[model samples]
Target: KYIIASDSSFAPFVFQNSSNQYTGIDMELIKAIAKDQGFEIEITNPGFDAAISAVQAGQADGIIAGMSVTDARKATFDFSESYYTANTILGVKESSNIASYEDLKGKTVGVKNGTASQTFLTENQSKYGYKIKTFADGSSMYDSLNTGAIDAVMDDEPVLKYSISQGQKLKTPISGTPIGETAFAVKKGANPELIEMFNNGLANLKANGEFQKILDKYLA
Candidate 1:
């Protein structure tokens, strides 16, 4: 069985709507890719850390979690081609004094653990000088911000935007430059056969109109 793991907390890319249905840009794209490749996909909705560990432990075949491709993660897991790219932004409450990345120095910042946000913060902390508060998901990260536990939250542009739009009580009036690319991941020594199949299928999807269609559905 082909098991694909994902974390649906990243909205628009992956999330549950009012109907509690598992549907989003990444979910739809995966379904389309499976159809094009003539393969059946079983989705596992575990959190980000669990999903990555599952793929690493041979418990799952791959992950389509809109996960950012970082040097830290690449050291352990093999990643597929980048399917999407977005900026990483520092979001703060409109009434708060923190306005930009520079202002975050000596302040508390919230981030989702095991994500590129965490990776970037770890690498750049010496220069940025912010205390990092980790959370399992973006919702909780925002929760810390709402309660004034953290001065700001750092995350992808699309996700931060979606959260604010849903009346999540956060504002991202300030944004930073674009960050790394987002890609799928698989186990380090997973079957080469499936890896080849994924590459071929992804190439075909990009070659045809399907790939653009999926992006337009989410972006347009």
Candidate 2:
């Protein structure tokens, strides 16, 4: 069995169900792919940062924690073919006045630590003149925004939308910008065979319509 790490709280992608079982797009996709590839995976949800660290430290075989494919991350890990594409957006409480990046000037925005949102804010904060605070997960980031600890939160478009739909009282004030690709990742050169297997299995899932079904289960 292969040990796979995932984020514990990325809902619609990875989260505990009402029965306390892990169930979401990422978890289901990995399971289906593993079934097709003739491998078994022991899934672990130790949060995102810890998951990435586990793979890098050889404690886990790979991760499918909604990890984004960036140049910096690619330097340390090998990513499979892009399984999902997402963008980042600035979200604010429904009562907030921050309607765009321009309105965030001199404001504080929340971002999940070590995520593409963090990277995007870091790269563009200067131009937007906003400061940033990092949270360990989306809940905390949204909490901060709701409590006014931060003026807004930056996160993946689907994640933010899901939260809002779940009665979070949040809205994306700014339109999303294509951030990066999301894919499974393994330690560099550590599991090339597994990576290939995943790619092939993923392609098969797509060809047979299972991939879109998985997405619709969460997104539609």
Candidate 3:
């Protein structure tokens, strides 16, 4: 059996259902793939940061945590063909001076592991000259910002907006823009078979309309 890592609360992608069973876009897709390919898998709902490190540490076979695979990340991860779309932004404690990327130089920018945020920050790190502080979850990432442990956080657009709407006192001066993707990844040079099986089974799901059904189930 292969161990796959996921996030505990990435709703519509992976989250606990009313029945208390883990179910969502990722949960359903991965399960369907496993069945189509005739392989057994064990999914662990560790935090996203834990999932990324676990895969790198060889504790998990692969990760499907809505991770973004940027050119900078290609050095470390061999990603499956991409799926899904999203946007991201830089979130700061409300009314802070760190309102722009230029102001971020020499500051610690918190980001989640295996995500668009981390890779985007990593790609821009040298130019921005900011420190990257990785976090396991956005909840904690935002908390660190509130406590001033991190000056800013890079995370999903809707998630950040949702937090602001929930009155978290955060602001996004660096607004989200085009470009985000999700992929299954293994440490570079490992698990090529998994990718092969995944591609075929994904096609199978799409061919049978199951994939579209899953999307419609959760996305409006």
Candidate 4:
């Protein structure tokens, strides 16, 4: 058995349903993988930063939190075969004239706490002359955007797309930056077998028709 950590509110990848059940692409994929490999798992949703910390602190065996795989991150964790490719996008109101990052000077941009989006924006914040406001999770980040507390948002392309589809009144004017593949992961040099099983189980799911269905379920 393994303890898996996840983001509490990253929709389409990880989110709570009406019944408060966590079920999204990441959750479904991991569950299927665990079942396919005959492994029992315990999942904990403590938000993204906490999830990462859980793994790093040895409180969890792995994480399936739609984490992007990057060389910068490789120093801390070993990631599984990427299950999805995604990007970070700057989302603004449909009528907002923020056509580029240059227009964001003195504006406040909201991002989920401890996300790659936060990293991306913070790295460029001084250059863009924009202030970064971090929220505990994506849902509150979106709310801040909706309430005009933030002028724009930097979030995952899929998550923004999902929110837009759900009528968030936001638009992606700028093209998304390829953050990299989103993958499951474990602390570096730890639980190598878990990685193997995740890769193997996911590969099996792809061939067995469960993978596409899981993606389609949340995306559609």
Q: For each candidate, what is the lDDT?
A: 0.79, 0.89, 0.83, 0.90
Instruction: List candidate 3 stretches off by more than 4 Å.
Output: 87-177
Report backbone clashes per prediction: 0, 0, 0, 0
Global Cα RMSD, each model: 5.3, 4.5, 7.6, 5.0
lDDT, candidate 3, 61-116, per-residue tens: 88887677789878877888876667878888877887779999899999999986
TM-score quality measure for candidate 1: 0.63
lDDT (10s digit) by residue, model 2, range 1-220: 9999999998788999899999988999999999999999999999999999999999999999888798999899999999988888888878998887989899998999998789999999889999999999877877778789999888888777666666667778677889778899999989898899999999999999999998877754
Better of 1 and 2 by lDDT: 2
- TM-score list, all predictions: 0.63, 0.68, 0.60, 0.67
Q: Model 1, 196: alpha-carbon shift in Å?
A: 2.5
For model 3 the TM-score comes to 0.60
Question: Candidate 2 regions off by >4 Å?
Answer: 89-155, 164-176
**Candidate 4: where are CA atoms >4 Å away?**
88-155, 164-177
Tens digits of per-residue lDDT for model 1, 53-160: 888888889998878888898787788778877787778887887766678889988899887677777888889799999999867887788889999887877777
